[PDB]
Nucleic acid binder design. Structure first.
Ligand SMILES: [Mg+2]
Length: 119
RNA sequence: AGCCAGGAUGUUGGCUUAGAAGCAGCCAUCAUUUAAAGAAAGCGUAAUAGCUCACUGGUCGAGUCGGCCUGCGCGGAAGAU
């Protein structure tokens, strides 16, 4: 269990680091304005511009959305772990141990993507 | 051959894409209500939407379709006293 324990916190830390690197607030802000623009119906009259806007939005959402998921997913995992601890059941514990890996992998992938920006 | 009607459902098939809803592609090209309805032949769009088409049901009420063999013609075919 000690390794599992180590993995929960470490993952969180790395997520935090990633977020910091991103400087996510700016991105969020951009998304917001972009979202607002999209909501306004006059943007779609000019097609190319609209398309561009759409392109801009999704990525912004997704990076930010990914981050959100990580934040939330991690929390969920923690909760699960807590539950397991409280109720001495093996299956739950096992689940707690396992589910975290996927999130970590996702995070890693995201980081990799961030790294290799050039075409 | 025209003419009148439908030209549905799962479904907007997923994806990758910025979006993809027959129609950017890439791929499967299946099944349903059955009279019949292509996971779609063309137009159309931001993409849907929208407008046709395929096949099929009515009207009508006799011939009709496009290959082959050969005859004769047509275009292709502009020049300097
Ligand atoms: Mg001749």
């Amino acid at each position: 269990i000690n390794p599992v324990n180590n993995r929960i916190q470490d993952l969180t830390e790395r997520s935090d680091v990633l977020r910091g690197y991103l400087d996510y607030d700016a991105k969020k802000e951009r998304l917001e304005e972009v979202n607002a623009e999209l909501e306004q119906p006059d943007v779609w009259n000019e097609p190319e511009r609209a398309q561009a806007l759409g392109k801009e939005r999704s990525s912004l959402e997704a990076v930010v959305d990914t981050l959100d998921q990580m934040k939330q997913g991690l929390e969920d995992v923690s909760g699960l772990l807590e539950l397991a601890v409280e109720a001495d059941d093996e299956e739950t514990f096992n689940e707690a141990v396992a589910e975290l890996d996927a999130l970590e992998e996702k995070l890693a992938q995201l980081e990799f993507r961030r790294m290799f920006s050039g075409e």
